[PDB]
A = this chain, B = another copy of it.
Amino acid sequence: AYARREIKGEWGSATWEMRSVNQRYLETYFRLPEQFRSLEPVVRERIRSRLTRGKVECTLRYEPDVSAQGELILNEKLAKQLVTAANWVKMQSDEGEINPVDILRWPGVMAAQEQDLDAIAAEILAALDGTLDDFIVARETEGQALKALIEQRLEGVTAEVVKVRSHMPEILQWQRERLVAKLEDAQVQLENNRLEQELVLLAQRIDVAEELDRLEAHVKETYNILKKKEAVGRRLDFMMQEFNRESNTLASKSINAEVTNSAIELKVLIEQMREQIQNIE
């Protein structure tokens, strides 16, 4: 998701910025200020410890409060040998004045009285963790929504399985009545005892009993994966394939309009789920 926090201390104001995008692995980038490039390893690990996946861009922005630094700290000794060097010229050259503003714009004469960066970073680090709290909270929140609507599709799945278990007896008699009706057009004498073994070992497979158990087993297993705190929902995308393998198993074996037209909604449910699982840790 996203989060930022301004701080504003005795030295200046600071602002953290974290954002997260769908990535397969965990990756992080850091565009920090220049005073704190010695902190980057601590922050990186502090992230990996609380995140496991996602491309995350973490940024800190430093606004220095010049009113409190004071800067200056005149190297009075160097300025003087700048003054004397200015004098040995002003005399030999026999011309010219001596601007002090120029004498100031020497690299080593005006060192900015840097502020307790060890105290500035000490309060920043306290704010880095404070944002991760606000960041993870933003990510769990969003997680609570998908969990519900994924479990929502699961209930829609259950509505689709039992609806199929219900039409199997009605369909398998119609295939018995259809297949046999040709044997009379074939004029062939009624096998009777040889028919039954053929009608059985033809209904199985062709009748959906096995995978419905699997799909129902998948639904049970799906719920607990969403209800664990451990190695999160990356495996869900895998289950959606197993869900799908039992779905398509039903597609190329189904013998009735009524079973197939409902079996599409399944494929719809899987994909609806397959979209919201890409947002799961």
Contact = CB atoms under 8 A, between A and B. Distances in A.
A197 interface: yes
Interface in A58-91: 59, 61, 63-64, 66-67, 69, 72-90
A180 interface: yes
Tell me whether chain A's interface is mostly helix, strand or loop, or mixed: helix
Given A112-B66, A235-B268, A101 B95 contact: no
A278 interface: yes
Given A88-B76, A198-B198, A261 B221 contact: yes
B260 A242 contact: yes
A61 B37 CA distance: 12
A165 interface: no
Contacts of A99: 89, 93, 95-99, 101-102
A140 interface: no
Interface range, A side: 35 or more
Q: Which 6 A-B pairs have the closest CB atoms?
A: A25-B25, A101-B102, A217-B257, A89-B100, A96-B99, A85-B100
Interface of A: 1-2, 4, 17, 19, 21-22, 24-27, 29, 31, 37-38, 40-42, 44, 52, 59, 61, 63-64, 66-67, 69, 72-90, 92-93, 95-106, 108, 110, 112, 118, 172, 176, 178-183, 185-189, 191, 193-206, 210, 213-214, 217-218, 221, 231, 234-235, 238-239, 241-242, 245, 251-252, 255, 257, 260-261, 263-264, 267-268, 271, 274-275, 278
29 contacts: A17-B38, A19-B40, A21-B29, A25-B25, A66-B112, A67-B77, A80-B88, A82-B105, A83-B88, A85-B101, A86-B101, A89-B100, A93-B99, A93-B100, A96-B100, A179-B186, A183-B186, A183-B188, A187-B196, A188-B196, A189-B193, A189-B196, A202-B203, A234-B267, A235-B267, A235-B268, A238-B268, A242-B251, A242-B263
